Amino acid sequence: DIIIATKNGKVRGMQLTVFGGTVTAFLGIPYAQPPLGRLRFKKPQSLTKWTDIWNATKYANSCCQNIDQSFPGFHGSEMWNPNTDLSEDCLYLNVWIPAPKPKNATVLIWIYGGGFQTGTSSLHVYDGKFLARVERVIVVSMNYRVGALGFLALPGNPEAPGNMGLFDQQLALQWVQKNIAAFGGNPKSVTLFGESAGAASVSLHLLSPGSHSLFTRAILQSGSFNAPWAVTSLYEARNRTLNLAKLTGCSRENETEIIKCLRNKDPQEILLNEAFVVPYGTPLSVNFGPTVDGDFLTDMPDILLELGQFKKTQILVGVNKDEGTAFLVYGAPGFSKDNNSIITRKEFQEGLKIFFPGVSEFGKESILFHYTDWVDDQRPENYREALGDVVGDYNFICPALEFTKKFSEWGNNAFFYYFEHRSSKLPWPEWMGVMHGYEIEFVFGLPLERRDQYTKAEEILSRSIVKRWANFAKYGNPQETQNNSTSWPVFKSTEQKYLTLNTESTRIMTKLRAQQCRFWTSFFPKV
Numbered sequence: 001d002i003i004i005a006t007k008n009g010k011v012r013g014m015q016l017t018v019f020g021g022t023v024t025a026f027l028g029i030p031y032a033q034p035p036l037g038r039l040r041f042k043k044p045q046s047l048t049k050w051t052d053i054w055n056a057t058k059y060a061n062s063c064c065q066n067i068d069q070s071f072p073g074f075h076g077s078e079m080w081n082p083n084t085d086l087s088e089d090c091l092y093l094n095v096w097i098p099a100p101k102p103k104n105a106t107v108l109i110w111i112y113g114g115g116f117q118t119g120t121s122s123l124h125v126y127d128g129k130f131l132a133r134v135e136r137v138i139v140v141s142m143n144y145r146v147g148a149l150g151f152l153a154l155p156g157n158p159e160a161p162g163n164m165g166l167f168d169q170q171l172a173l174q175w176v177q178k179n180i181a182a183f184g185g186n187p188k189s190v191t192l193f194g195e196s197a198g199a200a201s202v203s204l205h206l207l208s209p210g211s212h213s214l215f216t217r218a219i220l221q222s223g224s225f226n227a228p229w230a231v232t233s234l235y236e237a238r239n240r241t242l243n244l245a246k247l248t249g250c251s252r253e254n255e256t257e258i259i260k261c262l263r264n265k266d267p268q269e270i271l272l273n274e275a276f277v278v279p280y281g282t283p284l285s286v287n288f289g290p291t292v293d294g295d296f297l298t299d300m301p302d303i304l305l306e307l308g309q310f311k312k313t314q315i316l317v318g319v320n321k322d323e324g325t326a327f328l329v330y331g332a333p334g335f336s337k338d339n340n341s342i343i344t345r346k347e348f349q350e351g352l353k354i355f356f357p358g359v360s361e362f363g364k365e366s367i368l369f370h371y372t373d374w375v376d377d378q379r380p381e382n383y384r385e386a387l388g389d390v391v392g393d394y395n396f397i398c399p400a401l402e403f404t405k406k407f408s409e410w411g412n413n414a415f416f417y418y419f420e421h422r423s424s425k426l427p428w429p430e431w432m433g434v435m436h437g438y439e440i441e442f443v444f445g446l447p448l449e450r451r452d453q454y455t456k457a458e459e460i461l462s463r464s465i466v467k468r469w470a471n472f473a474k475y476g477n478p479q480e481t482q483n484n485s486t487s488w489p490v491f492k493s494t495e496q497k498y499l500t501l502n503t504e505s506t507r508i509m510t511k512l513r514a515q516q517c518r519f520w521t522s523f524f525p526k527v
């Protein structure tokens with residue numbers, strides 16, 4: 001029986017057997033007042049004592065959100081869907097700890113992706129018990145509001161100010177500051193880590209003065225706040241808030257009256273209209289995301305980044321070899337997960353239309369010009385490969401590299417990875433390669449479980465990544481120092497060295513996608 005006293009009450013956890021040892025898991029601790037009724041669309045409110053032993057013995061509700069129904073029955077997509085009840089009452093967090101209780105353990109705090117519209121901490125690929133067992137760190141993860149319920153904005157209006165879900169993440173870091181010593185944690189050694197929209201969220205906590213003192217270091221997997229999908233403009237945000245009002249018949253003249261109307265709507269009506277607050281959309285659409293609210297985010301974040309206005313600390317930033325492929329089967333003509341998807345030039349051009357809505361005709365042509373100068377015109381998989389590269393370079397790889405670069409220019413050590421291993425167990429087709437999302441299970445250590453059908457080379461790759469991630473958290477340096485591993489150099493502007501992660505031999509390379517990112521980064525933002 002393990003009871004820990006928190007500032008708010010006692011919590012009971014549960015014991016788990018992991019690799020012939022024991023981990024204590026406290027799943028589903030509340031960290032804020034449920035954001036129901038009058039609290040819907042407001043910032044999270046702090047929680048008050050219970051007294052009372054809260055049983056933290058199962059995952060809590062995931063936050064309200066639309067689900068992916070493109071491939072029913074398919075594990076590839078469905079493994080990403082929520083696996084606990086959806087509810088507005090979703091402001092909970094999990095803590096895994098080594099057994100025996102550690103003395104002053106480094107803490108890893110996971111923030112999930114999901115386009116800011118979906119996601120939950122209770123996915124099996126986010127389970128923190130292998131890390132706690134193997135590296136003796138504390139792993140913490142939290143649910144935070146997504147979609148309109150998390151990011152609806154009527155700028156400056158405390159009834160609906162924007163960024164509520166970022167504030168939920170933030171109030172969870174506060175909970176770790178106040179409470180993690182009780183569990184054997186070190187509040188002075190906390191590393192935030194996240195993937196996709198979770199990584200962009202980590203990058204914005206680097207920018208937020210309210211977050212500065214709530215953590216030590218940061219890890220960004222496939223995402224940064226300068227990615228083109230990560231920040232909504234004040235103009236867009238309003239248009240979308242009002243379009244939601246119109247679609248739910250909540251149009252008004254008094255903006256606070258609009259919000260009052262939206263709080264009477266049932267969670268489901270709001271969810272069902274979210275998708276149309278926008279005329280055109282893409283498979284990377286973030287209808288309701290971060291905005292500049294003058295609170296969480298004080299200025300346009302590109303300005304903050306450029307001018308050195310962020311937390312000074314080390315970062316670890318990486319991307320996967322084939323970020324863009326997963327998205328091609330959510331609407332690009334000629335694509336399918338059930339065949340090899342050899343598309344034509346005309347289909348490629350149509351695909352650009354899906355992913356670059358408007359986007360001038362000249363813009364789309366320039367993308368076509370940069371990516372289709374074949375060497376050579378023979379290769380039938382040409383146009384199919386070019387479209388995924390277009391998508392992953394624009395949306396993930398080039399913003400990550402540009403982020404790392406601008407961050408490093410202010411003096412801090414930074415380390416960049418390029419993840420090139422495709423899981424032996426991937427249920428997606430071979431042509432999709434090293435997909436977005438599929439480093440996560442390696443970082444969380446799932447392949448350490450032999451019972452599980454990953455190869456030997458995969459167990460070894462994972463064990464090594466886990467060590468580097470843990471050494472980063474504890475010591476600011478992602479080395480694996482014992483097994484003659486390749487040493488991981490800092491990423492500097494000028495050299496831009498990065499480390500490749502794969503089962504065969506890991507290399508030090510330079511200037512990833514140099515020629516492609518010159519296009520996305522200097523030229524395209526003009527069109």
Ligand SMILES: *[C@@H]1O[C@H](CO[C@H]2O[C@@H](C)[C@@H](O)[C@@H](O)[C@@H]2O)[C@@H](O[C@@H]2O[C@H](CO)[C@@H](O)[C@H](O)[C@H]2NC(C)=O)[C@H](O)[C@H]1NC(C)=O
Binds near residue numbers: 239247
């Ligand atoms: C701001 O919104 C307008 C339109 O407002 C929207 O109403 C919503 C209920 C939604 O269903 C959406 O379809 C509708 O657009 C956007 O302009 C729209 O673009 C096309 C033009 O062919 C029309 O179908 C819309 O009716 C038209 N506006 C209208 C109705 O006046 C506009 O793009 C958007 N501005 C942005 C992006 O900030």
Ligand SMILES: *[C@@H]1O[C@H](CO[C@H]2O[C@@H](C)[C@@H](O)[C@@H](O)[C@@H]2O)[C@@H](O[C@@H]2O[C@H](CO)[C@@H](O)[C@H](O)[C@H]2NC(C)=O)[C@H](O)[C@H]1NC(C)=O
Binds near residue numbers: 332340341
């Ligand atoms: C790979 O499949 C795609 C996707 O669409 C198809 O999925 C297949 C597995 C099959 O069941 C098919 O009936 C299903 O619609 C194919 O794209 C389609 O190409 C067909 C050619 O008959 C067109 O009629 C469709 O409009 C087009 N689908 C769309 C709208 O995206 C694709 O041709 C196929 N390519 C191969 C075999 O290499």
Ligand SMILES: *[C@@H]1O[C@H](CO[C@H]2O[C@@H](C)[C@@H](O)[C@@H](O)[C@@H]2O)[C@@H](O)[C@H](O)[C@H]1NC(C)=O
Binds near residue numbers: 103104186188474
């Ligand atoms: C726990 O250690 C505290 C200091 O933490 C520092 O050392 C490393 C953990 C590293 O991550 C640094 O960034 C931190 O500055 C110390 O002040 C506390 O008193 C310790 N608490 C205990 C042992 O109960």
Ligand SMILES: *[C@@H]1O[C@H](CO)[C@@H](O)[C@H](O)[C@H]1NC(C)=O
Binds near residue numbers: 055
């Ligand atoms: C919490 O769990 C304990 C131990 O299993 C149980 O005895 C106690 O009644 C529980 N409290 C509840 C069910 O609210």
Ligand SMILES: *[C@@H]1O[C@H](CO)[C@@H](O)[C@H](O)[C@H]1NC(C)=O
Binds near residue numbers: 254255256257
């Ligand atoms: C709008 O209506 C709200 C509803 O209570 C009210 O509080 C507010 O004063 C009104 N705003 C103004 C000043 O127009």
Ligand SMILES: *[C@@H]1O[C@H](CO)[C@@H](O)[C@H](O)[C@H]1NC(C)=O
Binds near residue numbers: 464467
């Ligand atoms: C070091 O290598 C041994 C085998 O020689 C292996 O079992 C262990 O997992 C390795 N440690 C790390 C952190 O990779």
Ligand SMILES: *[P@](=O)(OCC)N(CC)CC
Binds near residue numbers: 113196198284285437
């Ligand atoms: P991520 O948050 O993706 C989920 C892994 N990204 C694309 C989904 C934001 C648009």
Ligand SMILES: [Cl-]
Binds near residue numbers: 079125441
């Ligand atoms: Cl899995």
Ligand SMILES: [Cl-]
Binds near residue numbers: 375376377378379
């Ligand atoms: Cl060729």
Ligand SMILES: [Cl-]
Binds near residue numbers: 484485486505506
């Ligand atoms: Cl190595």
Ligand SMILES: [Cl-]
Binds near residue numbers: 512513514
């Ligand atoms: Cl390259």
Ligand SMILES: [Cl-]
Binds near residue numbers: 519523
């Ligand atoms: Cl160019």
Ligand code: NA
Binds near residue numbers: 366523
């Ligand atoms: Na050009």
